[PDB]
Design a protein around this motif. Structure first.
Motif, PDB file in Angstrom:
ATOM      1  N   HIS A 124       0.838  -1.187   0.000  1.00  0.00           N
ATOM      2  CA  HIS A 124       0.000   0.000   0.000  1.00  0.00           C
ATOM      3  C   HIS A 124       0.882   1.250   0.000  1.00  0.00           C
ATOM      4  CE1 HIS A 124      -3.475  -2.652   0.751  1.00  0.00           C
ATOM      5  NE2 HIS A 124      -2.674  -3.245   1.681  1.00  0.00           N
ATOM      6  N   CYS A 125       2.185   1.017  -0.065  1.00  0.00           N
ATOM      7  CA  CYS A 125       3.142   2.110  -0.073  1.00  0.00           C
ATOM      8  C   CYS A 125       4.263   1.760  -1.053  1.00  0.00           C
ATOM      9  CB  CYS A 125       3.679   2.402   1.329  1.00  0.00           C
ATOM     10  SG  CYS A 125       2.439   2.273   2.668  1.00  0.00           S
ATOM     11  N   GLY A 153       4.337   0.648  -3.583  1.00  0.00           N
ATOM     12  CA  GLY A 153       3.973   1.126  -4.906  1.00  0.00           C
ATOM     13  C   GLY A 153       3.956   2.656  -4.951  1.00  0.00           C
ATOM     14  N   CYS A 154       5.022   3.242  -4.427  1.00  0.00           N
ATOM     15  CA  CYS A 154       5.142   4.690  -4.401  1.00  0.00           C
ATOM     16  C   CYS A 154       6.314   5.059  -3.489  1.00  0.00           C
ATOM     17  CB  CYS A 154       3.840   5.358  -3.955  1.00  0.00           C
ATOM     18  SG  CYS A 154       3.031   6.169  -5.382  1.00  0.00           S
ATOM     19  N   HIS A 155       6.522   4.225  -2.480  1.00  0.00           N
ATOM     20  CA  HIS A 155       7.600   4.451  -1.533  1.00  0.00           C
ATOM     21  C   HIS A 155       8.601   3.296  -1.610  1.00  0.00           C
ATOM     22  CE1 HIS A 155       6.282   8.200   0.277  1.00  0.00           C
ATOM     23  NE2 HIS A 155       5.035   7.676   0.445  1.00  0.00           N
ATOM     24  N   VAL A 178       6.903   9.786  -7.328  1.00  0.00           N
ATOM     25  CA  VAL A 178       6.167  10.964  -7.752  1.00  0.00           C
ATOM     26  C   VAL A 178       7.024  12.210  -7.517  1.00  0.00           C
ATOM     27  CG1 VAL A 178       4.060  12.304  -7.393  1.00  0.00           C
ATOM     28  CG2 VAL A 178       3.976   9.784  -7.342  1.00  0.00           C
ATOM     29  N   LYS A 237      10.736  14.801  -1.960  1.00  0.00           N
ATOM     30  CA  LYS A 237      10.052  14.521  -0.709  1.00  0.00           C
ATOM     31  C   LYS A 237      10.262  13.052  -0.335  1.00  0.00           C
ATOM     32  CE  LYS A 237       9.371  18.604  -0.937  1.00  0.00           C
ATOM     33  NZ  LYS A 237       9.204  19.789  -0.067  1.00  0.00           N
ATOM     34  N   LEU A 263      11.523  10.035   2.744  1.00  0.00           N
ATOM     35  CA  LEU A 263      11.171   9.684   4.109  1.00  0.00           C
ATOM     36  C   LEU A 263      12.329  10.052   5.039  1.00  0.00           C
ATOM     37  CD1 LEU A 263       9.195   6.334   3.571  1.00  0.00           C
ATOM     38  CD2 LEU A 263       8.319   8.708   3.768  1.00  0.00           C
ATOM     39  N   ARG A 269      11.401  15.279   6.869  1.00  0.00           N
ATOM     40  CA  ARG A 269      10.262  15.039   7.738  1.00  0.00           C
ATOM     41  C   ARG A 269      10.304  15.983   8.941  1.00  0.00           C
ATOM     42  NH1 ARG A 269       8.650   9.728   8.386  1.00  0.00           N
ATOM     43  NH2 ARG A 269      10.837   8.985   8.572  1.00  0.00           N
ATOM     44  N   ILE A 272       7.294  15.387  10.857  1.00  0.00           N
ATOM     45  CA  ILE A 272       6.588  14.123  10.733  1.00  0.00           C
ATOM     46  C   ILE A 272       7.474  12.996  11.267  1.00  0.00           C
ATOM     47  CG2 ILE A 272       5.368  12.585   9.150  1.00  0.00           C
ATOM     48  CD1 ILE A 272       4.486  14.726   7.554  1.00  0.00           C
ATOM     49  N   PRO A 317      -2.769  16.525  -1.641  1.00  0.00           N
ATOM     50  CA  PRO A 317      -2.591  16.157  -3.029  1.00  0.00           C
ATOM     51  C   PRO A 317      -1.250  15.457  -3.204  1.00  0.00           C
ATOM     52  CG  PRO A 317      -2.348  18.546  -2.784  1.00  0.00           C
ATOM     53  CD  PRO A 317      -2.907  17.957  -1.491  1.00  0.00           C
ATOM     54  N   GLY A 318      -1.145  14.625  -4.231  1.00  0.00           N
ATOM     55  CA  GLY A 318       0.091  13.905  -4.486  1.00  0.00           C
ATOM     56  C   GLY A 318       0.041  12.500  -3.882  1.00  0.00           C
ATOM     57  N   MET A 319      -0.631  12.402  -2.745  1.00  0.00           N
ATOM     58  CA  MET A 319      -0.761  11.128  -2.059  1.00  0.00           C
ATOM     59  C   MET A 319      -2.232  10.737  -1.901  1.00  0.00           C
ATOM     60  SD  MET A 319       1.588  10.045   1.094  1.00  0.00           S
ATOM     61  CE  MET A 319       0.607   9.535   2.495  1.00  0.00           C
ATOM     62  N   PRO A 320      -2.533   9.500  -2.299  1.00  0.00           N
ATOM     63  CA  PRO A 320      -3.859   8.923  -2.238  1.00  0.00           C
ATOM     64  C   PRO A 320      -4.403   9.042  -0.821  1.00  0.00           C
ATOM     65  CG  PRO A 320      -2.419   7.410  -3.389  1.00  0.00           C
ATOM     66  CD  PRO A 320      -1.576   8.561  -2.845  1.00  0.00           C
TER      67      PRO A 320
HETATM   68  C1  HEC Z   1       1.914   7.273  -4.482  1.00  0.00           C
HETATM   69  C2  HEC Z   1       0.533   6.942  -5.039  1.00  0.00           C
HETATM   70  C3  HEC Z   1       2.010   7.178  -2.987  1.00  0.00           C
HETATM   71  C4  HEC Z   1       1.591   6.172  -2.190  1.00  0.00           C
HETATM   72  C5  HEC Z   1       0.922   4.891  -2.594  1.00  0.00           C
HETATM   73  C6  HEC Z   1       1.904   6.548  -0.831  1.00  0.00           C
HETATM   74  N1  HEC Z   1       2.517   7.789  -0.806  1.00  0.00           N
HETATM   75 FE1  HEC Z   1       3.365   8.723   0.691  1.00  0.00          FE
HETATM   76  N2  HEC Z   1       4.073  10.160  -0.431  1.00  0.00           N
HETATM   77  C7  HEC Z   1       3.753  10.340  -1.766  1.00  0.00           C
HETATM   78  C8  HEC Z   1       4.149  11.659  -2.202  1.00  0.00           C
HETATM   79  C9  HEC Z   1       3.958  12.198  -3.589  1.00  0.00           C
HETATM   80  C10 HEC Z   1       4.706  12.278  -1.140  1.00  0.00           C
HETATM   81  C11 HEC Z   1       5.276  13.664  -1.071  1.00  0.00           C
HETATM   82  C12 HEC Z   1       4.414  14.653  -0.291  1.00  0.00           C
HETATM   83  C13 HEC Z   1       3.390  15.322  -1.197  1.00  0.00           C
HETATM   84  O1  HEC Z   1       3.462  16.564  -1.314  1.00  0.00           O
HETATM   85  O2  HEC Z   1       2.555  14.579  -1.755  1.00  0.00           O
HETATM   86  C14 HEC Z   1       4.660  11.349  -0.035  1.00  0.00           C
HETATM   87  C15 HEC Z   1       5.146  11.621   1.257  1.00  0.00           C
HETATM   88  C16 HEC Z   1       5.053  10.747   2.335  1.00  0.00           C
HETATM   89  C17 HEC Z   1       5.734  10.936   3.594  1.00  0.00           C
HETATM   90  C18 HEC Z   1       6.635  12.091   3.918  1.00  0.00           C
HETATM   91  C19 HEC Z   1       5.893  13.360   4.329  1.00  0.00           C
HETATM   92  C20 HEC Z   1       4.540  13.030   4.940  1.00  0.00           C
HETATM   93  O3  HEC Z   1       3.555  13.680   4.527  1.00  0.00           O
HETATM   94  O4  HEC Z   1       4.514  12.132   5.810  1.00  0.00           O
HETATM   95  C21 HEC Z   1       5.403   9.893   4.385  1.00  0.00           C
HETATM   96  C22 HEC Z   1       5.850   9.622   5.791  1.00  0.00           C
HETATM   97  C23 HEC Z   1       4.512   9.049   3.623  1.00  0.00           C
HETATM   98  N3  HEC Z   1       4.303   9.583   2.364  1.00  0.00           N
HETATM   99  C24 HEC Z   1       3.942   7.855   4.101  1.00  0.00           C
HETATM  100  C25 HEC Z   1       3.225   6.955   3.320  1.00  0.00           C
HETATM  101  C26 HEC Z   1       2.705   5.696   3.800  1.00  0.00           C
HETATM  102  C27 HEC Z   1       2.862   5.182   5.202  1.00  0.00           C
HETATM  103  C28 HEC Z   1       2.074   5.106   2.763  1.00  0.00           C
HETATM  104  C29 HEC Z   1       1.367   3.783   2.745  1.00  0.00           C
HETATM  105  C30 HEC Z   1       0.345   3.609   3.866  1.00  0.00           C
HETATM  106  C31 HEC Z   1       2.197   5.993   1.631  1.00  0.00           C
HETATM  107  N4  HEC Z   1       2.907   7.127   1.983  1.00  0.00           N
HETATM  108  C32 HEC Z   1       1.668   5.732   0.353  1.00  0.00           C
HETATM  109  C33 HEC Z   1       3.140   9.397  -2.585  1.00  0.00           C
HETATM  110  C34 HEC Z   1       2.587   8.186  -2.130  1.00  0.00           C
END
Ligand code: HEC
Length: 80
Positions: A10-11, A13-15, A22, A26, A28, A33, A38, A53-56
């Motif tokens: 669930h992550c 695929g992006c993390h 994306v 930004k 981890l 953070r 964070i 925005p940017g994150m689902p």
């Molecule tokens: C792409 C579709 C993503 C998925 C799936 C998840 N995250 Fe994400 N994450 C994404 C982006 C583009 C960014 C940058 C911030 C923005 O402006 O969108 C982030 C950032 C984070 C961070 C760092 C800053 C914050 O807001 O916490 C963390 C800790 C984070 N994301 C956690 C996280 C987790 C736990 C996910 C699965 C449950 C997850 N992300 C999915 C893009 C995407």
């Protein structure tokens, strides 16, 4: 690693490798953070719920908040 099994689906695929597919500005990395602030488990459960925005998003339909507090952990065994 429990939470990893969830984050690695669930992550993952992006993390990918605490990276980003994306935004390459930004990560981890605490250094970042920190700016936003964070570095907590909870934070890594609420926001995920209704993030910007940017994150689902992730409601209690698939992953319950109680199950989220478990994810926040995964983000505390590499870069708290
Ligand atoms: C792409 C579709 C993503 C998925 C799936 C998840 N995250 Fe994400 N994450 C994404 C982006 C583009 C960014 C940058 C911030 C923005 O402006 O969108 C982030 C950032 C984070 C961070 C760092 C800053 C914050 O807001 O916490 C963390 C800790 C984070 N994301 C956690 C996280 C987790 C736990 C996910 C699965 C449950 C997850 N992300 C999915 C893009 C995407």
């Amino acid at each position: 690693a429990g939470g990893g099994e969830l984050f690695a689906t669930h992550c993952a695929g992006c993390h990918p490798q605490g990276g980003n597919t994306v935004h390459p500005e930004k990560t981890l990395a605490r250094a970042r953070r920190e700016a936003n602030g964070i570095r907590t488990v909870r934070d890594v459960a609420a926001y995920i719920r209704n993030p910007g925005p940017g994150m689902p998003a992730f409601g209690e339909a698939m992953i319950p908040p109680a199950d989220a507090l478990k994810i926040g952990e995964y983000v505390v065994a590499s870069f708290p």
